[PDB]
RNA sequence: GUGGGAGAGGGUGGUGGAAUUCCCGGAGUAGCGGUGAAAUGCGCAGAUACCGGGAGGAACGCCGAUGGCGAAGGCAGCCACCUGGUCCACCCGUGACGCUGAGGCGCGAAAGCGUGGGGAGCAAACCGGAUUAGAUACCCGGGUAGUCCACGCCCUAAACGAUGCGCGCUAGGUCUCUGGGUCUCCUGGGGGCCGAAGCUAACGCGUUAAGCGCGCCGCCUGGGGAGUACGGCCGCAAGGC
C-alpha cells in the first residue's frame, strides 16, 4: 500500500532525472502542486503541467539538465544532485525559526510547510515562521 | 531527401537489435524492420557537414575508420 | 458446489436496492454461505488442513467487513447480524 | 574501441550510426545506414566532396 | 516424421479411438515424447491422459516386446 | 444432475440369452440409480491388447447417461456386482478438444 | 457480480498393469548366488533358468520437461465425489472498507514415541565371510525395530532463493507455461537466461533487484567457553523453546 505520496513524488523525480528522461508523470494533489511550484520558481525543474491520463488527473514535470560534457561519460551535469525527504510518516520533523537549517551554505534549499504555506527556508526565516521540514534539495 | 531515399539510407535493423537510446531517430516500424526518420537525418546531416567544412577550411585533419567487409574499398577510395 | 440459483437468491435477498451486487450486506451474505458450506465440509473431512486456510481467510474477511459496517452504520450492522445469525 | 579512444583524448567523433547504436557516445551523428553500400557511397562521397571544395 | 504431421483432423479426448491412438505408441507400449509426436504441452498432456484411460479399458497395451537384438 | 459416459466390458462368451439378460439387469440398475440415457452404442467384439479375465476378447457397451453426481459412485459399485461384467468405467462427459485444426 | 481457463493443491471411496517374495502344479537337471578375487549362504529332501494357477504388501515404468500447483513442509497409475487458492475478459456494484503485525491459534519432510493392525522389498542394531601391523569401518550373505495404514504425541533440518511482507518508480533482448484480442503481432499473469542505469569488499544482482524510496515486524554487535550451565515453560520419553 502507498503510505507516503510526497516521498513517492520526490523518488519519481529522482529516478527519472538519473536515466536523463525528459518528462515524468506523478498523481496530482494541492500539496504536491505547491512543492512543484516551489521547485519551478527556484529554477530546479523546467516546469510542471496539469494533464489527464485515462481521466485520472496527473502532473507532468519537465526536467532540466546541464550542457553536454566532454570526454568519456559525456552525460550532462545534473541540476538536482540530491533530493531527500526529511519528515516521513512514523517520524514527523518540526522546527522553529531558530532551528531552520542551512543547506550547502545556501547553495541548496530546504522546503517547509509553514503556517503561511509552502516556503523555502529563506522565505520562512524572512517572514519569521516555522513548521514541518519536508525536504532538502541541492 | 531525393538522394537519401533512393540510396536506402533510411533502412535500419530488425526489432531484435535496436538500441533503445536510438529510439529518438526512428520514424516507424514496417514489416519487422526499423525505418529512420529522414527529416532528422537532414538536419543532423546539415549540422555535421557545417562542422566538417569549418574544420577542413581551418586546416584540420579528419580520420576515416571503417573496417567492415564492404566498407573497406569505399573508405580507401574516399580517403585517398 | 454453490449453484448459480442459490447465489442469485442470496444476492436478491440481501440487496440494498434492485440491481446491487457489491454492497457490504451482499458480500457478507455470500461469505456466510461459503463459510457454512466449508464448515460442514471440514466437519466431515477432519484431516483436510489445506481448506482450513481458505476457511480462516474467509472468516477474517467477513470480520473485517463487519467491523467496517459497524463503524460506519450501526443500524444496518445490527440488522445484518441478526438476519444472518452471526455470533449467536 | 576507436570511439572510446577518441572520447578518452577529447577528440570529436563523427559517425554514420544506425539503429543498433548509442547516439550519446557520438558528438556529431548521421542517423542512417551502415550496410547498403549505396548509403555509405552517398554519405562518404558527399563528405569528401565538401572536404575538397572547402579547402 | 512426426505422428501429428502424418495425420488428419481428430479429437484427442476420445479414449476409444484406437486406430489413431495406436500410432502414438512405440514398438514397446510407451507414449511417444514431444520429440516424436510434435505437439504442444497441453495437447501432449491430454494425449497422455487419454492413452492411460484407454490402457485401463484394455484397448491399448501397457508393455510390449521389440523383435530385435 | 450432470452428464456422464459409462463403459461396460463384459464376457464375450455369452450367447443371446445371457447377453440380453445381463443387458436388462444393468439397464434396470441404471434407471434404479436415477440415470437417464441419451444414446446407446454397441461396438460388438474388438480384440484386446492384453487378456482380461483369462480371455483375449470382450463385449463393449457404451451409454451416454445423465444422473445426479452424488449417486454416480454408488451406481458404479452396482454395475460391478455381476460376475460377467469385467470392467466398468464412468467418465464425466468431457469436450471434443479438436487437435490439428 | 457475470462469462470463462490451467494445474502432481487437499480430503474421502473404488479399481488397473508391469515387477519382487512365498505356496502349489508341469517338466527339468548339477550347480545357483556373490565379488577386484573369493567365500559365508541356497541346492541331490531336486536348487537355478521356463510355463501355468493362487495369496499378499509396497511403489506408480513411457509421458516427464531446464514443466505445473501450493504460504511453506510438500504434491505426479486411472475414475468419481466434496472442497481451497489463483488467472483473464466485461469495467457491471460498494466507497478507503487498507498494509504490516509483538503475543495467541493452526499447519510443519525425515527420524523418534504410545495404542492396534500389516509385513512383499529394503534395512539401524545384531550374526557370519573377506580385505587387511588393527579394524571395533568401507565389500559380501542373512537379519529385528523401522519403513505402510487409523488415531494421538514429538515440532527439528543445508525447513535454502542461505534473500520477511505490501506498494510505487527506473533500457532492453531472448526461451518457455497459461488466458483474451483486430492474431503481421499487440495485451495480462507465472517460471528461467544475457544484460542499461544503479548497487556491491568482491563474487555477483539487475521490472521475479542485492537499484531508487515508503510503512510495519524479526534479528546482529570479536573467536572459543556454548546453544553450554542454571531458572522457567512445554513433552510418555527422546528431547524442544
**Chains meeting F at 3+ CB pairs closer than 8 A?**
E
> With the C-alpha atoms ordered B12, B16, B19, B20, is the resulting torsion angle positive or negative?
positive
Buried b (16+ CB within 10 A) or exposed e, A13-52: beebbeeeeeebebebeeebebbbebbbeeebbeebeeee
Widest Cα–Cα separation across chain B: 46
Please state, in angstroms and rounded to a whole number, the distance separating the CA atoms of residues F7 and A36.
75
Angle subtended at Cα A78 by Cα A73 and Cα A83, rounded to the nearest 5 degrees: 130
From the CA of A113 to the C1' of G144: give the distance in Å. Answer: 82
Please state, in angstroms and rounded to a whole number, the distance separating the CA atoms of residues B31 and B2.
23
Taking an 8 Å cut-off on Cβ atoms, the answer to whether E11 and F7 are in contact is no
Taking an 8 Å cut-off on Cβ atoms, the answer to whether A72 and D7 are in contact is yes
Please state, in angstroms and rounded to a whole number, the distance separating the CA atoms of residues A102 and A123.
12
Q: Which residues of F touch E (CB under 8 A)?
A: 7, 9, 43, 46, 48-50, 52, 58, 62, 87, 89, 91, 94-101
Tell me the three cell numbers of residue A27.
498523481
Interface membership of D49 toward B (CB under 8 Å)? no
Query: How many other C-beta atoms are found inside a 10 Å radius of the C-beta of residue A93?
Result: 12
**Rounded alpha-carbon distances, angstroms, from residue A137 to A10, A36, A112, A120:** 10, 12, 12, 10
A75: the nucleotide nearest its CA (via C1') is: G197
- Integer-rounded Cα Rg, in Å, for chain A is 16
How many domains, chain C? 1
**Rounded alpha-carbon distances, angstroms, from residue F23 to E59, F40, F47, F60:** 22, 12, 21, 11
Boundaries of every domain in chain F: 1-97
Backbone angles phi, psi at A117, to 5 degrees: 115, -170
Q: Which residues contact F100 (CB under 8 A, 6 or more apart)?
A: E4, E7, E8, E9, E10
Of B25, B26, B78, the CB nearest to D44: B78
- Integer-rounded Cα Rg, in Å, for chain B is 15
**Rounded alpha-carbon distances, angstroms, from residue B62 to D15, D29, D41, D48:** 12, 15, 17, 10
Interface membership of E25 toward F (CB under 8 Å)? no
From the CA of E33 to the C1' of G163: give the distance in Å. Answer: 38
Burial of B65 (0-12, 13-18, 19+ CB in 10 A): middle
Please state, in angstroms and rounded to a whole number, the distance separating the CA atoms of residues E4 and F42.
29
Please state, in angstroms and rounded to a whole number, the distance separating the CA atoms of residues E40 and E22.
19
Per-residue 3-state assignment (H helix, E strand, C coil) for chain B: CCCCCCCCCCEEEECCCCCHHHHHHEEEEECCEEEECHHHHHHHHHHHHHHHHHHHHHCCCCCCCCCCCCHHHHHHHHHC
Torsion of CA A113, A119, A123, A124, to 10 degrees: 0
Give the architecture (CATH level 2) of F1-97.
2-Layer Sandwich (3.30)
Euclidean distance between the first and the last CA atom of chain E, given in angstroms as a whole number: 24
Kindly list the strands in the beta sheet with F85-92, ordered across the sheet, starting from the edge strand earlier in the chain: F36-52, F55-67, F2-10, F85-92
Q: Which residues contact C76 (CB under 8 A, 6 or more apart)?
A: C24, C25, C69
Q: B23-28 long-range CB contacts below 8 Å, 24 or more apart?
A: B24/D23, B25/D23, B25/D31, B26/D19
Tell me the three cell numbers of residue A16.
527519472
Resolution, expressed in angstroms to one decimal: 3.3
Torsion of CA B47, B52, B58, B60, to 10 degrees: 140
Give the chain D residue nearest B36 (alpha carbons).
D32
Please state, in angstroms and rounded to a whole number, the distance separating the CA atoms of residues F12 and F16.
11
Backbone angles phi, psi at D21, to 5 degrees: -125, 165
Please state, in angstroms and rounded to a whole number, the distance separating the CA atoms of residues E54 and F2.
23
> With the C-alpha atoms ordered A117, A119, A121, A122, is the resulting torsion angle positive or negative?
negative
- Integer-rounded Cα Rg, in Å, for chain E is 12
Nearest to F59 by CA among F35, F27, F30, F23: F23
Could you say which DSSP state residue A105 is in?
G
Interface test with chain D among B5, B48, B68, B80, by most D beta carbons within 10 Å: B48
Interface membership of D35 toward A (CB under 8 Å)? no
Angle subtended at Cα B38 by Cα B37 and Cα B42, rounded to the nearest 5 degrees: 125
Of E10, E56, E62, the CB nearest to F99: E10
From the CA of D45 to the C1' of G230: give the distance in Å. Answer: 94
Boundaries of every domain in chain E: 1-69
Nearest to A97 by CA among A60, A58, A127: A127
Tell me the three cell numbers of residue B5.
531515399
Please state, in angstroms and rounded to a whole number, the distance separating the CA atoms of residues C75 and F94.
50
Amino acid at each position: 500500500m502507498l503510505t507516503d505520496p510526497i516521498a513517492d513524488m520526490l523518488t519519481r523525480i529522482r529516478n527519472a532525472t538519473r536515466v536523463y528522461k525528459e518528462s515524468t508523470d506523478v498523481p496530482a494533489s494541492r500539496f504536491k502542486e505547491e512543492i512543484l511550484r516551489i521547485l519551478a520558481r527556484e529554477g530546479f525543474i523546467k516546469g510542471y503541467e496539469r494533464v489527464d491520463v485515462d481521466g485520472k488527473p496527473y502532473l507532468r514535470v519537465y526536467l532540466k539538465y546541464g550542457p553536454r560534457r566532454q570526454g568519456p561519460d559525456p552525460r550532462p551535469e545534473q541540476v538536482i544532485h540530491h533530493i531527500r525527504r526529511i519528515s516521513k510518516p512514523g517520524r514527523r520533523v518540526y522546527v522553529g525559526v531558530k532551528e531552520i537549517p542551512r543547506v550547502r551554505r545556501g547553495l541548496g534549499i530546504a522546503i517547509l510547510s509553514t503556517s503561511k504555506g509552502v516556503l523555502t527556508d529563506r522565505e520562512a526565516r524572512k517572514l519569521g515562521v516555522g513548521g514541518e521540514l519536508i525536504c532538502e534539495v541541492w | 531527401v531525393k538522394e537519401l531515399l533512393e540510396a536506402g539510407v533510411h533502412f535500419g535493423h530488425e526489432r531484435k537489435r535496436w538500441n533503445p537510446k536510438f529510439a529518438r531517430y526512428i520514424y516507424a516500424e514496417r514489416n519487422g524492420i526499423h525505418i529512420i526518420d529522414l527529416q532528422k537525418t537532414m538536419e543532423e546531416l546539415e549540422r555535421t557537414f557545417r562542422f566538417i567544412e569549418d574544420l577542413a577550411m581551418r586546416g584540420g585533419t579528419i580520420l576515416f575508420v571503417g573496417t567492415k567487409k564492404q566498407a573497406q574499398d569505399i573508405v580507401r577510395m574516399e580517403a585517398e | 458446489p454453490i449453484t448459480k440459483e442459490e447465489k442469485q437468491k442470496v444476492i436478491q435477498e440481501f440487496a440494498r436496492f434492485p440491481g446491487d451486487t457489491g454492497s457490504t450486506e451482499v458480500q457478507v451474505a455470500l461469505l456466510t454461505l461459503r463459510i457454512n458450506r466449508l464448515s460442514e465440509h471440514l466437519k466431515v473431512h477432519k484431516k483436510d488442513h489445506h481448506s482450513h486456510r481458505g476457511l480462516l481467510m474467509m472468516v477474517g474477511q467477513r470480520r473485517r467487513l463487519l467491523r467496517y459496517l459497524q463503524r460506519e452504520d450501526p443500524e444496518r450492522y445490527r440488522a445484518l447480524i441478526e438476519k444472518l445469525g452471526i455470533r449467536g | 574501441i576507436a570511439v572510446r579512444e577518441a572520447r578518452k583524448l577529447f577528440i570529436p567523433v563523427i559517425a554514420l550510426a544506425d539503429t543498433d547504436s548509442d547516439p550519446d557516445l557520438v558528438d556529431y551523428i548521421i542517423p542512417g545506414n551502415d550496410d547498403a553500400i549505396r548509403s555509405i557511397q552517398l554519405i562518404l562521397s558527399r563528405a569528401v566532396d565538401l572536404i575538397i571544395q572547402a579547402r | 516424421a512426426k505422428v501429428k504431421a502424418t495425420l488428419g483432423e481428430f479429437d484427442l479426448r476420445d479414449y476409444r479411438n484406437v486406430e489413431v491412438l495406436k500410432r502414438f505408441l512405440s514398438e514397446t507400449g510407451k507414449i511417444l515424447p514431444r520429440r516424436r509426436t510434435g505437439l504442444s504441452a497441453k495437447e501432449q498432456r491430454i494425449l497422455a491422459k487419454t492413452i492411460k484411460r484407454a490402457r485401463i479399458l484394455g484397448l491399448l497395451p501397457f508393455t510390449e516386446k521389440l523383435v530385435r537384438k | 444432475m450432470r452428464r456422464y459416459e459409462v463403459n461396460i466390458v463384459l464376457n464375450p462368451n455369452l450367447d443371446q440369452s445371457q447377453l440380453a439378460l445381463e443387458k436388462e439387469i444393468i439397464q434396470r440398475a441404471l434407471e434404479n440409480y436415477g440415470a437417464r440415457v441419451e444414446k446407446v452404442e454397441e461396438l460388438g467384439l474388438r480384440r484386446l491388447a492384453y487378456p482380461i479375465a483369462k480371455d483375449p476378447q470382450g463385449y463393449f457397451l457404451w451409454y451416454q447417461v445423465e444422473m445426479p453426481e452424488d449417486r454416480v459412485n454408488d451406481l458404479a459399485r452396482e454395475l460391478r456386482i455381476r460376475d460377467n461384467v469385467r470392467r466398468v468405467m464412468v467418465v464425466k462427459s468431457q469436450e471434443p478438444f479438436l487437435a490439428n485444426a
